[PDB]
Assembly symmetry: C6
């Protein structure tokens, strides 16, 4: 059944994304800490956020990190659960999920892969409205701002999402999670090697330089392959008999199996989407007399 706890991952685990960290802090921490200011200015705190970007870039990690920092319970609803709700034609369970989230406030309700249903039906003879997202947004409208329940959605295909969600009262802001850069990749590599002992001759900077287009999942996979090679070598040596830490050789061997999950076309499309939004922004020249 559902698991409700305080995620262990902290801010240090996530490398880079300083602006997104600051913005998420502003959105989540401030309303609970200082409601007096919001009352004074009569502004209604934002209800939720929507992360969109290429897969394996740090969305679920960001949600867990903010939940841990706020010290609030975290409820995760993966895509297969949504698809099970759709196929079984039993959409009445969303009410139960929302009630469970309400019971354990403060909380952050994370709807992973919010686009799964849209993809499953083509990405489709019908329109853009399905029988699960309808219930989700109905319950979202029906909730009370008195409770500190924060809804976060994550997708890697922000062009088939039902537009009704992005209305001002349900999920206003859109945050873009880009591919890591050189400094970001160095930070990612540093973060992931805190658990696996590594020889000191390894140069993380050089490794980060050579992997230009890479998602975080790819760097994690590289680390796992290096660890697996080391384990295999150690076990073979133990088997040798009569008849401990990763070195550079294992990383060199592992890099041959590295691959780029996201093709250049997908990144180009994502930057096109971001540029479209930033162009629709407009109003670069403005000032009172």
């Amino acid at each position: 059944e559902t698991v409700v706890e305080v995620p262990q991952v902290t801010w240090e685990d996530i490398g880079g994304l300083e602006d997104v960290k600051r913005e998420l802090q502003e959105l989540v921490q401030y309303p609970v800490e200082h409601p007096d200011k919001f009352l004074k200015f009569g502004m209604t705190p934002s209800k939720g956020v929507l992360f969109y970007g290429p897969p394996g870039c740090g969305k679920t990690l960001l949600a867990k990190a903010i939940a841990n920092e706020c010290q609030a319970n975290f409820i995760s609803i993966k895509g297969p659960e949504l698809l099970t709700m759709w196929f079984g034609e039993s959409e009445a369970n969303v009410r139960e999920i929302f009630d469970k989230a309400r019971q354990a406030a403060p909380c952050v309700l994370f709807f992973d892969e919010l686009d799964s249903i849209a993809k499953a039906r083509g990405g489709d003879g019908g329109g853009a409205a399905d029988r699960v997202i309808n219930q989700i947004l109905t319950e979202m409208d029906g909730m009370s701002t008195k409770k500190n329940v924060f809804i976060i959605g994550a997708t890697n295909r922000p062009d088939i999402i039902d537009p009704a969600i992005l209305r001002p009262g349900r999920l206003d802001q859109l945050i873009y999670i880009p591919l890591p850069d050189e400094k970001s990749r160095v930070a990612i590599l540093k973060a992931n090697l805190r658990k696996s002992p590594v020889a000191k001759d390894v140069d993380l900077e050089f490794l980060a330089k050579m992997t230009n287009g890479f998602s975080g999942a790819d760097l994690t996979e590289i680390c796992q392959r290096a660890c697996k090679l080391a384990i295999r070598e150690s076990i073979e040596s133990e088997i040798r008999r009569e008849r401990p830490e990763i070195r550079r050789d294992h990383f060199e061997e592992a890099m041959r199996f590295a691959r780029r999950s996201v093709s250049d076309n997908d990144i180009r499309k994502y930057e096109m989407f971001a540029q479209t939004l930033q162009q629709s922004r407009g109003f670069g020249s403005f000032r009172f007399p």
Copy 2:
């Protein structure tokens, strides 16, 4: 469950739309106040209306304002509820809604996003008749004019709505809610700032001049962004420690993130629809001997 009350908004809240205000008054207030004249002329009061226009222009606000002025209960039926009835194949709940509206007369029954079902199926292998609008118009026909129940519909896509609703006995009139003009935008900005204190140096007229194509929702969003910026600045200042009213700088900053929800093509299409209806009117030359 459903909420039945007297909406709080009033006429002074809504900016502009003087002609629509007068026409709605004529449609709603007059029948109840002076039934003697209608009896003398033997006229049957109009049963409902249908607002059509681009999203975020002030339809729900107009319905609430007229309900408040008439001092009558207001029942809102949003689009997600209609879609829930369609998906669940349980269209027999419309009878319950109409019974509830009848029980609390005088009342105005507001059907928001009356075209949602049509969009959900493409906008579609079948025809223009669905299984929910059928029940709605059946109940509408089966009602008694003795009661003071007024049906108001809204929609931002008045070209896929089922033509059967627009028959003389169900929803005769069609009102057009255009985008605000310069004076309308100034009034809108004045109305929305009655809650958030603002520095006197702000020039609302200049701000309204520079936003040519804008819906009311966009101006509200601009105000909200300015308020959020002010709250963030105050929070940062308080956090600074040792180691109250919005100014012009916050509006200048917020304007950079402003956006136009409705594209030019949509406004062109709506103007084309209005001009098509007006051309269909015709008969500009008429005078008895």
Copy 3:
């Protein structure tokens, strides 16, 4: 529930259509009055009729007028009732309707908008047979001619109607209800003003001359708009305070909002249908030696 009564309308209410009046009389009155002649000649009385023509021309009025003249109960089955029988997949209620009609003989069963189901499915992957018309014609075949139950159908789209109905045993004839002419328009205007007092200076002939392509519903709407304008003016004058009959000014104002419901293309198509039937008639030259 259903309403079974004697319609209050009368032949005078309907303007024009003298030929159709005479033919409907010949079809309905003669069978009941003088069954002896039919027995002598061994001819079976015709069972039903099918009106077809542009909307708002006087079909329901014709049915009600004939029912009133025969002094027989009138049962109306609107289009939405058929559509809800189709959507709910409960077509067994047609037996109940026919039994109710049989119980209260003599009666005329009026199936309004008999083509609604065909339109609802496109006008369509399948063929021309649905699950409601099937039951209707089964019951129609299964009834006894000794009873005086008369089935009258109406439709404004006599090209998607299932051909099985038009077989000799079910619905023999096809009457055409054309748009009113100048004399017909004058009569229509005279009929509708029997209840609204009107100043003597109004010239109905001139008004009828200037409305070339119109339907009865449009003329009724013109009258309603004039009455609404008069009521508004009277109420405003009463409101003036310190601080009864229609005139030509009100009609002049109302005519600006007049419109033609049916486009020229539809009239052309209907005329082509009628001419196709009259060409299929043929046999102009014929005489025995």
Copy 4:
């Protein structure tokens, strides 16, 4: 419910079709009368027949006449009943129909409009097998030849009919019912006037000459129109007051409204089908030494 009785019609009622009369006699009469010959030759009597031709030519009349001649019960299953069984998804009732036919042997089971289901599906995404014809042919296979139950099918579209029925064990032969010829038309007109007294000056031969392409239904309709005109004239004369047999004038008037149900293209297609079968026959030259 179902009606099981001996049809009243006789051979004299049907005009023409001598060859088909002889064939039907040879098919049904001989098996029951002289089973000894069939036993001696060890031949299995043919089980059923299939009538195919343009509508309204005398298929049901042929079935009724042969049933009356054999003095056997006649069970009729119209098209609407088959369509009702298809729509309701309850095809298990065919077993009951066949059992009822068995209980009343000798009998002829007449499946009117055997192609209705195929037409209702388009004439269609699926194949040529439906859920009712399957049960019909299953029961046909499961019947005992000892009983004298004769299955006769009719249809006016012998190209969408499921080919499985025409296999040797189910429905062997395919009789063709053509449009009446001049002598056939004269006989048809003579047959239908046995009930309506007619002035002796009427020349049936001349009337039949001038109707080149006509079906029996059209001639019956002409007679009915003449009778209706005479009835109307007599009713008017009786109404005259102070203030018996059809003459030629009534036929002259009725001829104006005559029509041809079957177009030339349909007759061309039917003749094409018959000639295709005849060409497939072949083997015109054959003789032993």
Copy 5:
């Protein structure tokens, strides 16, 4: 209900197909008679077969003949039974059929028209797997080779049958049942005339010569037509009154109504299929040193 017995037909009834007779003997007789050899060589006996060819060539007859020769029960399953199991969505009855076959071992289970479901779907939006053939495969895999249950399938369209059936463990071999040749046609005619007495003057060889492309069903139909003509002539002679064996003249007359069930294109396609398989065989040159 189902019938389980030992078919009466024997080898001498079927004409020609000597090679197929020998191969079926090798497939069926040898496993039961001499299991010792199979145990010694450690080879698993083949489980089933699949006949494919144009309709009416002697597939069912071959199955019945092998069943009779082996003196084992024969369970037949026609296409309509499979189709009704598909339409009713009750595929769980296949388990009962297989259990019944197991109960009466040794037996041969004959699935007639194994492609009926595929044809009924078009020959189709979906793939090549249906809901009944799946159950057949499951039961076939779940069977025990200890029992002597032999599965034989037939089909006259071996290009839409689900490819999963032809896997090594389910139905390995395929046999082609060609159209009879001249000698085969002579044998077929001889076999079918063992019942109807025939005058010695008839020359079967000449009749077989003149029918180049015919199927067995056509020859049976020719014999039946000749017998029917003889019966009709005898009946007429007996009816004549005052006021035994088929001759050549009856065959001469019956030949006129003979027809070819299978068109040349179908035989060309079947020959193409056989040639494709034989080309895929290959390996005509092979020998060890």
Copy 6:
């Protein structure tokens, strides 16, 4: 019901595929034997594998061999069972299968023909997600790494499987099972002849040389055909009466009926798939300073 046992087949039974054997050993045997190393390095053992290649190359044999070597229970789920779960809309039985696998750890769960559902729907109006694979991967995510349950999947069409399975947490690695080479073919032939006695003069090398493109199933079929020919010859000799080991003649005869299941186009496509993955690998040059 399901059968759970230790498969009999061993490594010796399978010919060739040395690299695949070593990799499967590394994946399965190592985690259970030396968990201390994995704990020390903090690496999480891989959960499953996914074989892909042309049919009949030895995927099931590899799974059974690894299960036997690890001495762990083996549970097989064939394609027909998955299709049965899909058609019946009863996908809740996957929980039962996974529970059964958990109960008997250590075990290897083998989902044979994992793509069957995708093929059955075209390979399709909808997307890439079905109602059974969803439950499978949900349960796979919900499993505990503490138990030694190893999910192995097989599929001979790795271009339509749902991409969600190939995510890092569900089924990480993809292994290619290519067509046997000359040495592999010789080994395959040697393995399959351990049960059927064969004359010493047979030259397996020469036989393997002449079959360039052949799957293992084809070689097994050749052996089976040779055995069948030998059995038939022995049976005939025994039948001869008055009135033991396979030789080269039987193989020479059997070669005539040999065939190639996989066309060259399929091998080309599979090679292109492998080359695409190996190109996506990239990173041929890498070395720290």
